[PDB]
Paper text:
Here we used cryo-electron tomography to determine the structure of the native γTuRC capping the minus end of a MT in the context of enriched budding yeast spindles.
Subboxing of the γTuRC at γTuSC positions, followed by focused refinements, improved the resolution to 7–9 Å resolution. The coiled-coil protein binds the Spc98 GRIP2 domain, γ-tubulin and α-tubulin, where the coiled-coil end flares: the density for one of the α-helices terminates while the other α-helix continues and interacts with the β-tubulin. Notably, no coiled coils are bound across the Spc97:γ-tubulin:α-tubulin surface. The observation that the coiled-coil protein binds exclusively to Spc98:γ-tubulin:α-tubulin, and not to Spc97:γ-tubulin:α-tubulin, implies there are Spc98-specific structural features that underlie this specificity. We reversed the charge of a conserved acidic patch on γ-tubulin (γ-tubulin D421R, E425R and E428R) that directly engages the coiled coil and that is the largest interface with the coiled-coil density. We observed a temperature-sensitive phenotype in a yeast strain with a mutation in the γ-tubulin gene (tub4-401), indicating that the γ-tubulin:coiled-coil interface is important for cellular function. Due to the limited resolution, it was not possible to establish the identity of the coiled-coil protein from the cryo-ET maps.
Residue numbers in the entry:
A (entry chain F): 165 to 423
B (entry chain Sd): 112 to 199
C (entry chain Sc): 164 to 205
D (entry chain E): 1 to 210, 222 to 306, 318 to 412
Amino acid sequence: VTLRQLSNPYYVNTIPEEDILKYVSYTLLATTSALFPFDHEQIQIPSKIPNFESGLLHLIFEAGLLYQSLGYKVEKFRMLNISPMKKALIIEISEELQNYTAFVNNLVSSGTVVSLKSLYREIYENIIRLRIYCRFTEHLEELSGDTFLIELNIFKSHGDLTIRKIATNLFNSMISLYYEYLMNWLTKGLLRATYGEFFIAENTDTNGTDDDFIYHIPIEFNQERVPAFIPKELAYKIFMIGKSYIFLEKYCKEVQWTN
Amino acid sequence: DVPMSQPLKEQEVREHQMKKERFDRALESKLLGKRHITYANSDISNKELYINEIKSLKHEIKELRKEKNDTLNNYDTLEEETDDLKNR
Amino acid sequence: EIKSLKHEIKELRKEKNDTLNNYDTLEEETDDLKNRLQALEK
Amino acid sequence: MEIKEVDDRAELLRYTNNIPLLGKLVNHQPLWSTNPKLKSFSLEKISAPDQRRVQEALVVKDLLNVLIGLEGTYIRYFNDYEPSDPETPIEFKIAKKMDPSFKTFSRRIVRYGKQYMILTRAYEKWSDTSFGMVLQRFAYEIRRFLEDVYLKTLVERLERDFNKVPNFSIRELEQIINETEVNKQMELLYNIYEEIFREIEERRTNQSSQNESSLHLRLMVAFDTTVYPVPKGGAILKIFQQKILENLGDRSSVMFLKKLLNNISQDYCTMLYEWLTQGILNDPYQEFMTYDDLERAWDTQYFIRKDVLLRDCDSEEDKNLLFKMLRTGILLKVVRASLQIPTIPSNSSDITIQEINDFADLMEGSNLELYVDKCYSRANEIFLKLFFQG
């Protein structure tokens, strides 16, 4: 006879793979599961499942809990106001989350995998990516865009390829808006929506010396905020370009030529 | 035969080169000693992976602390079972 | 003083490992008496 | 088997920074010795030849569970195993009522699974930056192996044979594994990892311990004899090289060795090509054997990391070659600083340097010397032109 019959009386009190899948569908979707009573933090797995199967379902529900915690974090960060670079970072995180959601939905609807080992081997890449995103969001609520790009360029030097790829994607999405700020300041002299992420700032804090800015020129050039990928001479040139543009538009009244 | 005598031109050019080399090395050691050997006393740190604090160890301590209790608890249970089964 | 606390915690871990060895010999005794139970029942 | 009731709850590990970026972030399942979920069945009831098939099937199942790092019913974790400790020794206790031949086969397979778990934790820890991206790449490659060779072959052969193949024996399973030779590859990689760990230990032993041609040269060059606790840079690749020197006679062994060596040292030869063609220094992991200060006002002192060297630089020829390469890079950096250019295009002279693809062929061959002499002559030409005309 088959080996299944030899071990049949040993697992007569276990859950078949069908209900296992039917309820892991609910559990990984952050929804409640009747077979596995799911708490906000605890999966609360019954003891009927073997211990090695318990470990594999622990990994699966770890992926599910990473997804749920990433959803909680993205909801929290969406409820808070952030810089447009942080907005694009949140957009990238939500894109990764919805891609993983579509992936697991295709896995559930298709159901081509028959061995949970090969299933875990297939989903291991997405599990690692979700773990990376959680490791990143652990300190996301603290660092600014400059430290963001620093860590991204660092991880682009990492020996791994997935971390380097994600870091490059986020670096590009942030440097797009950085170049947008640069172009805004270079074309109109505008510090609008910079969120302090720009090395030139406006300083109207006067102590009585030229309160009307007849000669004060209330513009400051922060050398420390100048990133490494731009020379200090070029940053000073950009600052002087913007300052001279504002000087022509406000003092010289050369509206047409400046326009 | 007999051991050949060391050449005269050879010893002359050798003493000349050796005098020149002694002078050159003295002058080089006199001129600030450009030769140096250093030891690397610096390491890079990458904030996102750089641990904000090692206090997690004590945290892990607490964690292991809890685990300790569990072991004890389990031990007790096993004892009971043993005794129970022993009575059987 | 943190290193001394970690050393004391490691000593506590060693004591708990001794308790775990006691648990292991208790477990092997339990397996032996379970085999005895199964033999005397059947 | 009677189901035993234990509170199994999976929670995410709250603190993860002390865990490697590739380390597991979930709690481990309870142990059979501590919180069993099924009542074990005595093997002496099925140690008879008529029931030997049931015992063999259960042993094969437990072995397949062990190969992925999970525990079973008869082969449980050892007494010293700690599921919450990443560095604890992971051994196993096999049921004493098992068949002797089955016991030997289970010992072999549990050794394979233990090597798998050890290499898993190894590349997980190696995901840290302290080990160097190069080693990280190696770590990655290891995982790649475990993601493409070990687990794939396991699930494709052994699970299928244990599920839908009657008359299957554990001897046939061991013979199939030996045919796949993934066990032999894992054994050799485990030997390599043991040698690497022993080298780390030896670097930990010598805690207190760690030429006139440099003064002859008008260069602000210094030595950096700092030894790292773990091998980094060429010290890693040399090991691979040494392994190639120790795996001669087996073609597949040397093939896989050179494959991994090239896949890992691609980044290092790219960095070396950048240094020798542009003088651009970028070593965020301290894996290159050349770094300077100012990362005396205009003069920066270059330091040669002795631990991440590519050669011993003990002979006069090797020392002169290293001096020539360092001087080439320094002249490139000086030309870039004087011309205020980020990079030097190849059209600046009639000499071109191609990028290195195979590190082993570059080492054993003189094409490295060809490239070095070519770029050195190019840099000398450009520098002499700029100083005689500019």
